[PDB]
Design a protein around this ligand. Sequence first.
Ligand SMILES: N[C@@H](CCC(=O)N[C@@H](CS)C(=O)NCC(=O)O)C(=O)O
Ligand SMILES: N[C@@H](CCC(=O)N[C@@H](CS)C(=O)NCC(=O)O)C(=O)O
Lengths: 221, 221
Amino acid sequence: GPAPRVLELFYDVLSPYSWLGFEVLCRYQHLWNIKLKLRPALLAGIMKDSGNQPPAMVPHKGQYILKEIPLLKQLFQVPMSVPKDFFGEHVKKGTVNAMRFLTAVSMEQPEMLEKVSRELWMRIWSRDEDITESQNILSAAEKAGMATAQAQHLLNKISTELVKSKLRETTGAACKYGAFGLPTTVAHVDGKTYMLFGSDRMELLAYLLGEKWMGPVPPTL
Amino acid sequence: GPAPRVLELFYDVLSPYSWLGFEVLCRYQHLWNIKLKLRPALLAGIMKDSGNQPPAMVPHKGQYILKEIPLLKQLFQVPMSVPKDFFGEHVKKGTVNAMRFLTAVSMEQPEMLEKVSRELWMRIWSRDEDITESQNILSAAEKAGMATAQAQHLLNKISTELVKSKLRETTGAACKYGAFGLPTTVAHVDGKTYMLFGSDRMELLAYLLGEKWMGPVPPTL
Ligand SMILES: N[C@@H](CCC(=O)N[C@@H](CS)C(=O)NCC(=O)O)C(=O)O
Ligand SMILES: N[C@@H](CCC(=O)N[C@@H](CS)C(=O)NCC(=O)O)C(=O)O
């Protein structure tokens, strides 16, 4: 049939909404005529370029997010839980090491990107564990089924210039597309380019794609 | 059968997303076991009684909104078109008048609230006409099917203290629920209270209610 439409998903494991958007597209890549391309980006890098302000700046907005997540995780069926101090410890510690590792993985082990991204989320957004320390990142990759030698090998590269600039490029591409936050999904359909922000634009995306929307947890074939 | 669940929708005709959320709930009040209670509120008051600035302050973000509206109007099937001087004209001015009239309508002519609200949006958000002048607001009420004498009568009360404070009270109730923008929908289900922001949370609202989601334009049959 018709060539699949390419979907570029820009995300940062630091983001709970990115994990929601990510699981939804991951589920639909076996149902819609699409080709999912995972693009590891840095939220901080995107908020920096886009000159975007902290969505928490507003007391009711930040509060709202923390009360919303526990409801959305049920709908989307993603085992996540609001950290003990998200806006404090995880956000300020950062994700550069994680995002750079995922970048290395997308360059050398593209078939593991999905699972390793999921494991890093399981740590920070499911078990409130740390994902800034090499041995922790390494544990995530190993749970994702990656061999210890291979994981360590990629980890050794996150300090490389190839990987460092690959991350900066990938997050610059998202801004060039107009990104101002994550998740950002860019859909390439019949010569057109759509940029959708958030994990609640998957139903609009189906419409633009001419695909059928069946909820965040569509029925497996 | 179980008593219907009350859904409170806070909206301001100034808001294009409030109109989207508004039409969605208006179409589902015939399908879901719910009771829709339209609550006219003033965005500006919500923006103040919460300290939340206009979302267009982030350059990349205002642009996203104006590009997204044309796509969402199709999905939702709502005849809207983006104004010209949205800022130094429609917004800079205000809707205080239109929201006060809608408040008077909700107090004396509750069965016309829906239609009149829909006609005021048709003006500002569909034909880019004005809705700050009495004779204009009047025109909206007439197209809604409201007799000119009745409409004029209500218009004469928008200066009253009853009406003025009713609008302030209603928009304050939104803030007490945690509102930081519009549309804000508050669902009361089994003793629990959910506050959902946006026209893109109806699919989560359906899950919380135990109802079936069938897109922004459910099968009226
Ligand atoms: N409404 C979106 C919210 C997504 C969101 O708030 N993402 C955060 C990072 S986890 C962000 O990038 N925000 C930028 C903004 O709100 O302008 C959803 O339901 O997924
Ligand atoms: N993504 C939401 C956006 C709703 C929105 O942007 N609402 C505006 C008024 S029209 C607001 O009150 N924004 C406050 C904010 O974004 O913090 C939707 O699809 O409804």
